[PDB]
Amino acid sequence: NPVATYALRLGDNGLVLAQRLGAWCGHAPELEIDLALANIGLDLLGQARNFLSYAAELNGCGDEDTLAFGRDERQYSNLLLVEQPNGNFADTIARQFFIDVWHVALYSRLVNSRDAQLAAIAAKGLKEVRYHLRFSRGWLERLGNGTELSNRKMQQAVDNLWRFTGELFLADEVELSLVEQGIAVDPRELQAEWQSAVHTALLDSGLQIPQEAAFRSGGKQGLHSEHLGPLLAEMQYLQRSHPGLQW
């Protein structure tokens, strides 16, 4: 049960963020960005499929589709960060950078997991996360250290998302128990790697680390912002209308 819930959390993060990136298709500032966003969206959905498929195998019933399409928002366990709206390009880039930096720190360590399936999924994911981080860090620098206007938008984007970064290093007893068995990564021990990356990139972009102490958690417990509900209404519609079919 703990391993199933842990696995599902990593899948959910990837799934929900993937959904958000999908909304960008054909709406990006340049055709190259359209392509890059869709590529990241696709990688993340691949990761979601992997984690969710394993979670379904661990539970002994269902599949990536039962999990994605038949759970409600109180059962979804994604970080609150990945469910934030796309907002402007800086908001998308802020959200992506915080997540990629975290995925890099996470998958690097989770690839030494005593769970062989978890280690393998993570080994695949890390290679992709490294690409995502280069893109997101690149845009953070281009925007923060761009014009006066892009610098302000990028600072605003960072400020607006900061409170949700606390969940990145929030540990519960699922995390802790699985970490002691050498299976999960204790999210608290990810702070140093994440902070060294993110503080450096924000500095290099000529920007400021928010002084606000990040305080928002609940996603892992099914306690979501009011953003998730409408995301799921859209994501799940057809499956709800026409359940139990092959597509």
């Binding site: 054909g26 500032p29 340049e30 055709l31 399409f69 206007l149 057809l238 597509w247």
Partner: protein, 302 residues
Amino acid sequence: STEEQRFDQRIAQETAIEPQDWMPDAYRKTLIRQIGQHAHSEIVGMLPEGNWITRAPTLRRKAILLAKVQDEAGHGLYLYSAAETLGCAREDLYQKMLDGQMKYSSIFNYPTLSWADIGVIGWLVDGAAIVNQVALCRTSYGPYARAMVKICKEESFHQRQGFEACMALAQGNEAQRQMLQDAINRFWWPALMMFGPNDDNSPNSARSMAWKIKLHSNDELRQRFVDNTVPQVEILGMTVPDPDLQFDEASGHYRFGEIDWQEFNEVISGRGICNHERLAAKRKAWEEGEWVREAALAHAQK
């Protein structure tokens, strides 16, 4: 002139025209026109299918659609490069597209009203695209012909995937079968119109055929699409919304009904179902993205 005669002879012998070769100014311009509007089409074409990305019924079908829309974007880029070899600028022709001074394919002005429409677009719309594009693999201008080769390789995969999505509905519940038929009923004639006007209402053809830009006539390609596709409709157990469709054993072709040319002219002149919405979306993306492009430039310069 000696320039003009040399060109006509190079065309006759099927020697690829390359960006540094002399070409009639009308040949250069009709290719900027055609390649540019082909490129425009890849971009606007992201929108009807993209409309369903967040709503796709399974994760597998959602992943396929995401890949397809990503491929379309890449096809746009390939085509903009090719058009630029002729000396135009991507940014300028894009702007003409936004303002309504260049066209894009009539097909993208039709709305996606159900998930079945997505499979039907992959099947019929990419189907019509492929027939046209394979025919252009021997187009006379090298960059264009090589762009068509690169693209058809990727695109035939996605056409197959769209047909497979259609087959799932065709083998599924009664509601799924009905969804499929309705999507076909709405997209059949629009797909036929992608081949362009009739051969005697085609301004484009005279020059395009002569200069070997167009290798088969609109009507020739359309007939070949109908001949190839009717049996695929049969495979799905579906119908065609054409009371006049029948096989002519004598000719060896399907004989098919008359296109609504009045609709087609409404559509290409900006008065179709989604014309305004499509250009609005692309204009909105352009304008709202300005600060990002300016940021990217200001950062590059530093």
